[PDB]
Amino acid sequence: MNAPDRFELFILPDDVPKLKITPDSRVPNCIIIKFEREDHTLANLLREELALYPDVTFVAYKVEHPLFANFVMRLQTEEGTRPKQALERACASIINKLKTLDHKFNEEWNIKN
């Protein structure tokens, strides 16, 4: 009678953006990103990918409430780099790593036959 729908976890409404970027003015060259309809799966992956770049100085995420399906991520970079650019770079790098992983798994499965 107060239970929300089990598909509001992942189905993005039309009035809710998938992604929203605001800058943190306290420290230089930092941005706050809210990811809607996502959870720890994307957040931790992105966080541990970004934490290993030389040009990324701060990166973190939190899920403020478990009953709401979003997370917010703080990411700072050095003077030349833009945190947004580091975010596309991390996404592309993880995509390539998964592609190589898929190719090798398929080859291994074929060899096992």
Partner 1 sequence: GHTGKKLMAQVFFGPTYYQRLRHMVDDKIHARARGPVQVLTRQPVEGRSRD
Map residues 40-79 to x or -, x wherever contact with partner 1 holds by CB under 8 A: x---x-----------------------------------
Map residues 7-46 to x or -, x wherever contact with partner 1 holds by CB under 8 A: ---------------------------------x---x--
Shortest approach of partner 1 to residue 44 CB, angstroms?
6
Among all chains, which residue has been given the structure tokens 């991390």?
A: 90
The DSSP code sequence of 86-112 is HHHHHHHHHHHHHHHHHHHHHHHHHHH
What long-range pairs does 53-57 form, CB within 8 A, spacing at least 24? Answer: 53/86, 53/89, 53/90, 55/80, 55/81, 55/86, 56/81, 56/83, 56/86
Judged by beta carbon, residue 44 or residue 96, the one nearer partner 1 is 44
Task: List residues near partner 1 by CB under 8 A.
Answer: 1, 40, 44
